[PDB]
Write a protein that binds this ligand. Structure first.
Ligand SMILES: CCCCCCCCCCCCC/C=C/[C@H](O)[C@H](N)CO
Lengths: 296, 246, 41, 246, 49
């Protein structure tokens, strides 16, 4: 009342209507019949890409069409069913031989190591989902042999194992999976465990403050809200079992939510965490032709 | 009736005679962090007139063989005005932006600029070294250029591996020297956290690429500058302590 | 009528598949709604 | 609001940015022959999408000293498309037309074209022989030019004795290079019989005369072409038999 | 009903209104008085042939 420039905007800064309402689209859109229209001033073909909006010239407004009760399905295009298929994520090599007196293997959980799934899950900038992990484990030749294995999950902070029979393997608190090599692959479900509200595959910034160099800026882009710990694997034994072992990990993304789409990468990958490429060999997205007006 | 337009924020205003539209990024206005999404318990600060205004960066001269420029936000506004001071004194920053890029030219010049925003515009090191200990990484001044803004080295890949063709999925707008002379984009706060730092993480980046190169006949004006102006909208700051530049 | 055998919601299979599109936020993210049959400018 | 225009027929469309009007010849739309006026007893055929579309003839280069062109209808569309085949297989033909002539030029060129239709455009033999046995008569290719279209020899008299000044009583339209860049005319079926042959009698002819000659300063574009496009509307055919070209 | 692109135009291809109605004009047209009009935007002299 005494001063009202402060109340006039406080009661005007509520949720501003940004109507972009969507509708439940079960099947693809049909079409409606259209005759010829010889009219001036109403031009659906003339657009303006400079407005940042895509053309809305539909079929009925341009050519004479019939009507079709389109019954085609669109369910296989939702991101849920797009990421619902498991793919390779990481492979560990456990050489428990006489010359390799380690006994355990360790894998930093990072799905950015194999391009097949990285290329998909990097077309979106912010993703939030639950994963379904499946561990197949074979020998180097691909054989199964009745040796019991232990997979331990080491979240960020816990002590990583230091030996085949170290105390860390007691897994009093860490989740762990004991399974034999001659059993179905071990499958578990992991939730959205990031401290943030969504995983981000691109983090345009630095983790910490301070002076940042210009020669080896090895810390740029590395977001900590992504690193989710470590995966340790061993064979349950006191003495070495002479065998070469190989554990492959597959992850399924369920209950997915994606945000801020992104162009799909064209140049090949060179690094795991960084989106590096080479300016010497720029692989153009379109294959080359002989001439422009000679469509093959 | 639709070519003319006037934006006004704080104590500043922008006119335009040939720009025809206002691209609202992702169909959402900049708003304050609602209580159901806030994590910080302290009370933030909301000047709304000291920082919410149109800051005009320097001008970049469009040459016949230019390659494009990029800016980072809110990196550019970290040393200018009360926005710069609030961002240097506060730890948690949140705000949307209103971009406006002007590049006027006579009705005889020709060319087209692509003005887009790239949420989380992570740059890339251009080099074929595959070991992570010797691989080249972009320097600090190349990734956070500042108010000056940096230039591209190969815009066909946006210095980020991704092709420029699909970059149109981003909130974008063309500057076609035959129809319009400036492009404007209202972008909200795009981040995976309610608030974030203003000196470490840059929410997004602005991209200006001369797709159709500048071309003109002899005698016309050769100095065709590009000017960008930015207005932080619905800004909040929190976590006050001593001033840290970076 | 899908079911979950564990009391944790993130163990279910495909709890709810949805048909919800909203292209008008990527295809027409503009301020003043352009009509489909009129001139843009 | 009135300069922009879009015509659409069949699978074809035509845009235009500077043409401002649609001349409906004699204020009547093309319609089907009503039963109260039909004489043929057989049932005609009405494709309405195979033939009703915009066929684009070749382009004629407007020179500084050009003299004008003329086309005959439906002579032009007797070898192209399903219209050509229907007209070669059927004896009785009936249809209206939609003409659209485009001749664009920069805002520095000047000139004016007269685009008119002449129902029953009977040409004349240019010669002073008064005996009907030695008098000159126009050859077949001069009176039925075809898709190529023919040129005038003295347009001031329209090659038909009548002056060009009064030719404005016909359904016409100007192409003035300062205001408009294309002219369009919707003409119905104009004939003294319900149906007629499509290879013997041409209902009307199109006339394009450069009244105000093309004039431009040096350096501008010299190749100024004229393009005509035709859409047969509400077409009917009858009397089917073997194919007769002429 | 089964295919309706064929009915939508059959019942739409009736006599299209081409209104150019004339009137019975017995004598030549008269004229009505007119004062001076100093107005912008309404120009009866500017035509477009
Ligand atoms: C005993 C069970 C061991 C297997 C379960 C290990 C926990 C899995 C946590 C997965 C965290 C989300 C998926 C990972 C995403 C990306 O790799 C990171 N954001 C960085 O690349």
């Amino acid at each position: 009342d005494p001063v009202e420039d402060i109340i006039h905007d406080a009661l005007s800064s509520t949720v501003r209507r940004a109507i972009t309402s969507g509708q439940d689209v079960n099947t693809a859109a049909g079409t409606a019949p259209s005759s010829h229209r010889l009219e001036t001033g109403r031009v659906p073909a003339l657009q303006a890409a400079e407005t940042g909006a895509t053309s809305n010239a539909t079929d009925e407004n341009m050519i004479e069409t019939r009507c079709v009760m389109n019954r085609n399905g669109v369910l296989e295009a939702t991101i849920s069913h797009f990421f619902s298929r498991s793919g390779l994520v990481g492979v560990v090599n456990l050489t428990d031989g006489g010359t390799d007196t380690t006994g355990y293997a360790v894998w930093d959980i990072d799905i950015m190591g194999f391009v097949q799934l990285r290329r998909k899950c990097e077309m979106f900038t912010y993703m939030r989902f639950n994963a379904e992990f499946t561990f197949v484990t074979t020998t180097e030749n691909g054989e199964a042999r009745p040796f019991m294995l232990q997979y331990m999950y080491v979240p960020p902070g816990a002590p990583k194992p230091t030996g085949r029979d170290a105390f860390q393997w007691q897994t009093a608190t860490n989740p762990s999976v004991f399974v034999k090599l001659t059993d179905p692959p071990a499958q578990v479900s992991v939730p959205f465990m990031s401290p943030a509200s969504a995983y981000q595959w691109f983090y345009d910034g630095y983790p910490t403050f301070g002076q940042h160099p210009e020669t080896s800026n090895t810390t740029y882009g590395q977001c900590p809200n992504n690193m989710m710990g470590t995966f340790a694997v061993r064979v349950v034994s006191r003495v070495a079992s002479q065998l070469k072992l190989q554990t492959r990990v597959y992850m399924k993304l369920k209950h997915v939510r994606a945000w801020i789409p992104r162009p799909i990468r064209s140049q090949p990958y060179l690094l795991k965490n960084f989106p590096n490429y080479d300016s010497s060999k720029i692989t153009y997205s379109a294959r080359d032709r002989a001439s422009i007006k000679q469509a093959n | 009736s639709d070519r003319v337009a006037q934006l006004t924020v704080g104590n500043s205003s922008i006119t335009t005679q040939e720009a025809a539209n206002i691209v609202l990024a992702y169909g959402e206005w900049p708003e304050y962090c609602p209580d159901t999404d806030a994590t910080a318990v302290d009370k933030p600060t909301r000047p709304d007139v000291s920082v919410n205004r149109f800051y005009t960066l320097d001008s970049k001269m469009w040459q016949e063989n230019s390659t494009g420029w990029y800016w980072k936000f809110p990196d550019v506004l970290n040393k200018t005005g009360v926005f710069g001071q609030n961002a240097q004194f506060h730890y948690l920053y949140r705000s949307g932006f209103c971009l406006h890029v002007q590049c006027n030219a006579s009705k005889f010049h020709q060319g087209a600029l692509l003005v887009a925003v790239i949420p989380e515009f992570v740059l890339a090191g251009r080099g074929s070294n595959t070991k992570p200990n010797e691989a080249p990484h972009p320097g600090f001044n190349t990734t956070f250029p500042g108010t000056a803004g940096a230039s591209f080295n190969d815009p066909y890949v946006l210095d980020s591996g991704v092709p420029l063709s699909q970059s149109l999925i981003y909130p974008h707008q063309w500057i076609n020297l035959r129809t319009n002379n400036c492009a404007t984009i209202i972008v909200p706060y795009i981040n995976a956290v309610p608030f974030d730092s203003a000196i470490n993480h840059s929410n997004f980046g602005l991209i200006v690429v001369p797709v159709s190169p500048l071309k003109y006949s002899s005698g016309a004006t050769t100095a065709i500058p590009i000017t960008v102006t930015i207005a932080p909208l619905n800004s909040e700051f929190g976590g006050l302590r001593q001033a840290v530049s970076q | 009528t899908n079911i979950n055998y564990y009391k944790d919601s993130y163990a279910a299979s495909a709890s709810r598949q949805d048909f919800t599109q909203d292209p008008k936020k990527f295809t027409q993210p503009v301020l003043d709604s352009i009509r489909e049959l009129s001139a843009p400018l």
